[PDB]
C-alpha cells in the first residue's frame with residue numbers, strides 16, 4: 001500500500017528514496033507505481049516541448065513549461081538545452097572544433113570532475129562506423145576522446161547481466177544476475193523482465209559503483225531509470241542535479257537509453273528503420289553536451305558512452321525445437337531463445353536424468369544449431385557456471401538462431417528480426433566504448449577490452465577504492481591521462497627447490513620401462529650444464545612463473561624445456577619451452593613408444609608410476625613438453641621423464657597429440673618462433689579458481705595421481721614478428737587456451753574425421769586469457785620482461801577470439 005496523497009512539491013527527482021507507505025518522487029517511483037499523486041503534473045512537465053525558439057527568448061518564466069528560456073534559467077539550472085544557442089548566439093557543442101582537455105576546467109566548488117555514464121542498450125560495435133554519418137555528436141566524442149574499436153560484453157549477452165557487470169566489475173556468476181530470467185532454488189523464487197520480484201535486493205550481489213562511491217563519501221544514486229520517463233526529461237534531470245549546491249550534488253550520474261535495442265529487435269541490426277533511432281540517440285547526446293557547455297562543465301566532466309551488447313539477425317524460422325529431439329519434453333523447463341538452460345519441471349520426478357537429456361541433444365542432426373553442455377564443460381572464458389541460478393544443462397546456440405521447447409511457444413508467443421544473448425566472442429554481440437574528458441586521453445584508440453574492466457576505471461575516475469572484482473586493475477591504464485593505478489606484482493609465496501641428482505635408478509619401483517640403456521667428456525659436461533640451467537634463458541623467456549600459494553615444488557631444467565614440478569600433485573604446474581621458426585618436428589622412435597624414465601632428481605615417493613596407468617583402463621598419459629619437438633635424438637630422452645608425464649584420457653590424447661605434433665610448429669612458423677607454457681588445471685567445483693588437494697574428485701585408479709579437469713597452454717611471441725620470439729625487443733603477442741580434459745570428443749561432432757578437420761576448431765572455442773589461467777592455477781606469469789607492468793596486465797587480459805573484422 002502507498003499513501004499517494006502526499007506531494008512532490010519541491011521534491012521532483014529527489015535523490016534519497018523515501019520509505020513506504022510514504023509516496024515517492026524519485027526517478028524510480030513509476031516502476032513501483034508509488035509516485036505521489038502530483039508527480040506527473042510537477043515532475044513530468046511537457047508544455048511547449050524541449051527546445052527554445054526565437055520568440056521564447058527572454059520570456060517571462062512560466063513554471064508550467066518543460067524547460068525555460070527566460071533570463072533566469074541559467075541561475076535556476078533549468079534552461080532547455082539549446083537555450084544559449086537559440087537565445088545567446090552560442091554554437092552547439094558538436095559544431096566546435098575539438099580541443100584537447102589537458103586539465104579539468106571546472107567551476108568553483110567542484111571537488112573532482114563528475115562522471116557521466118551514458119548507457120545505450122543494444123548498441124552494436126559496428127554502428128560507430130556504419131552509422132557515423134548520422135551521429136555527429138557521438139562521432140565527435142569518439143574521434144576526440146579515447147575509444148576502442150569494440151568492447152566485449154559478458155555472457156550471456158543480455159541487458160541485465162551486462163549492465164550489472166558494468167556497475168560491479170563482476171562476472172554474472174558472481175553478481176548473481178545470470179540472465180534476464182532466473183529461478184533461484186534456495187529462495188524458491190523467480191526473477192523476470194516483466195514484474196517486481198526483480199526489484200528485491202536479494203538478487204543483486206556484489207557492490208555496484210553507486211554503493212562503492214556512497215561508502216567512500218562520493219555522492220551517487222542508482223543508475224536505473226523508469227521506462228516512462230522520456231529521455232529529454234532524463235537529461236534535464238541530470239543537468240538540474242549538476243546545478244545542486246556543492247554539498248548536495250552527486251559526483252556520478254547515469255543516463256540509460258532503451259534504444260537502439262528496442263528497434264533492433266523489431267527491425268534487425270541494420271534494418272532501414274534503424275537510422276532514426278541512431279539519429280535520436282545522437283540528438284540526446286547533443287542535448288547533454290550542450291547542457292554541459294551551458295553549465296561550463298563540458299571540459300570538466302568525464303563522459304563514458306558505453307553499450308551493454310550488440311544485436312544479430314534472428315527470425316522465428318531459425319528456431320530449433322527440443323520436441324524434435326526429446327521424448328520427455330514435458331518433463332523439462334527450458335529458459336529459451338539465444339541460449340538454453342534446462343532443468344527438471346518437477347523435483348518430485350526421480351525419472352528425470354540429465355545424462356539422457358544431454359545424449360539426446362548431442363550431434364543428432366547434421367546442421368544442428370545449438371550444442372548441449374553440462375555447465376562445468378562450457379568454455380572457461382565464459383565464466384558461466386558457479387551460481388545456483390545457472391542450470392546444470394546449458395545450450396550454446398549458434399549466432400542467428402533460437403532454441404525453444406515446442407513450436408507452439410514460437411507462434412502462440414513472426415514479429416522480430418533481431419536478438420542477442422549469444423557467446424560473447426561473437427562479432428555481432430560486441431558493443432561500444434568511448435571515454436571523453438579531462439581524465440581520458442585525447443584522440444586515442446585503445447585495443448578492444450572486456451566490460452568487466454570498466455568498474456575499476458570508473459573507480460579511478462572518481463578517486464575510489466574498488467570493491468573486489470573480476471577486472472585486472474591497471475590493465476586499462478592506457479585509456480587514462482592521469483589517475484592511473486599503479487599496481488605492484490603480487491609476492492611469490494612458495495620458493496622452488498632446485499634438486500640435483502639424489503636417487504639411484506634402482507630406488508624406483510614405478511613399473512616403468514625404457515629402452516635407454518644404449519650408452520664422452522666433450523658432451524658429458526654439456527649435458528650437466530643443461531640440467532643446471534644453461535639453456536634456461538632460451539626456454540624461460542619471461543622469468544619463472546611465481547607460485548602464489550603455499551606448496552612444495554621443484555624447478556627441473558633440461559636442454560629443451562624447464563618445469564615447475566609439484567611434489568603434491570605429482571606433476572608439473574607449468575612446463576616452459578621455446579620453439580624457433582627453424583625447429584624440426586620428429587617422431588617418437590619405435591624403441592621409445594612406451595618409454596617412461598625415472599627422474600633421479602625427484603624421489604620415488606614424489607613420482608607418478610606406470611603401473612597405475614596400466615591398471616586404469618580408462619586413463620592413459622601424455623607429456624607436457626612434446627617429444628616431437630626435441631632438439632636432438634639425445635635430448636629426446638628427457639621428454640620421457642616421469643616428471644614430464646600427465647594423465648590423459650585416450651580421447652583427449654588425440655587433441656593433445658595433434659596440438660603438439662602439428663600446431664605448435666605451425667604457430668612457430670607463422671609467428672617467427674613461439675614460447676609455450678603448458679600445464680594442468682584442476683577446477684572440480686567449477687569456480688574458475690585453482691582447486692586445493694582436498695577438492696580433487698578423480699585420481700588415476702589406485703593412486704594419488706590427480707586427474708586435471710583441463711590442460712592449458714600460453715603461446716607467446718613478438719608482436720613485431722620480424723623479430724624471433726627469443727630475441728624480441730618490444731611488445732609481446734599471446735594466445736592461450738584452456739582445453740577441457742574430457743573422456744570423449746562428444747563436443748566435436750566431426751571427431752570421427754582426421755584431427756586436421758576438428759581439433760583447431762575445438763581449441764578456438766576454448767581460447768582463454770592468461771588471467772583466466774592465472775586464476776585457475778595460482779601462478780603469476782610474465783614476471784621478468786622488459787615491458788611496463790600495466791602493459792603486461794593488458795597482455796594478460798587479451799583474448800584471441802578467432803573472429804573476422
Ligand SMILES: *[C@@H]1O[C@H](CO)[C@@H](O[C@@H]2O[C@H](CO)[C@@H](O[C@@H]3O[C@H](CO[C@H]4O[C@H](CO)[C@@H](O)[C@H](O[C@H]5O[C@H](CO)[C@@H](O)[C@H](O)[C@@H]5O[C@H]5O[C@H](CO)[C@@H](O)[C@H](O)[C@@H]5O)[C@@H]4O)[C@@H](O)[C@H](O[C@H]4O[C@H](CO)[C@@H](O)[C@H](O)[C@@H]4O[C@H]4O[C@H](CO)[C@@H](O)[C@H](O)[C@@H]4O)[C@@H]3O)[C@H](O)[C@H]2NC(C)=O)[C@H](O)[C@H]1NC(C)=O
Nearest residue numbers: 173174175176204205206386387388468469470687688775
Ligand atoms: C570474481 O571476483 C569475485 C569478487 O572478488 C570473486 O568472488 C569472491 O570469491 C571468494 C572465494 O570463492 C569469496 O570469498 C568467500 O566469501 C564468503 C563470504 O561471502 C559473503 O560475503 C561477501 C563479501 O561482502 C559477499 O560478496 C558474498 O556474496 C555472494 O553470496 C551472496 C548470497 O549468497 C550473493 O548475493 C552474491 O552474488 C555472491 O554470490 C557469489 O559468491 C558465492 C560465494 O561467496 C557463490 O556461492 C555464488 O554462487 C556466487 O558466485 C557473501 O554474501 C566466505 O564465507 C568464504 O569463506 C569460506 O571458504 C573458505 C575457503 O578459503 C574457508 O576457509 C572458510 O572456512 C569458509 O568455509 C566455510 O563455509 C563453507 C560454505 O558453506 C563450508 O563448506 C566450510 O566447511 C566452512 O564452514 C570465502 O572467503 C567471495 O564471497 C566472492 N565474492 C563475490 C561477490 O562473488 C570471484 O572468485 C572472481 N572470479 C574469478 C574467476 O576470479
Ligand SMILES: CC(=O)N1CCC(c2ccc3ncc(CC(=O)N(C)Cc4ccc(Cl)c(Cl)c4)c(=O)n3c2)CC1
Nearest residue numbers: 028031160163164167198199204222223224225226256
Ligand atoms: C540493485 C538495486 O539497487 N535495486 C533497487 C532498484 C531495483 C529496480 C527498481 C526499479 C527499476 N526500474 C526500471 C528498471 C530498468 C532499468 O533501469 N534498466 C533496464 C537500465 C539499467 C541501468 C543500470 C543497471 Cl545496473 C541495470 Cl541492471 C539496468 C530497473 O532495473 N529497475 C530496478 C533493482 C534492484
Ligand SMILES: [Ca+2]
Nearest residue numbers: 121122159308
Ligand atoms: Ca540490452
Ligand SMILES: [Ca+2]
Nearest residue numbers: 683689690691
Ligand atoms: Ca576450483
Ligand code: NA
Nearest residue numbers: 613616617619
Ligand atoms: Na590405462
Ligand code: NA
Nearest residue numbers: 745746748751
Ligand atoms: Na565427436
Ligand SMILES: [Zn+2]
Nearest residue numbers: 122261265420
Ligand atoms: Zn534486447
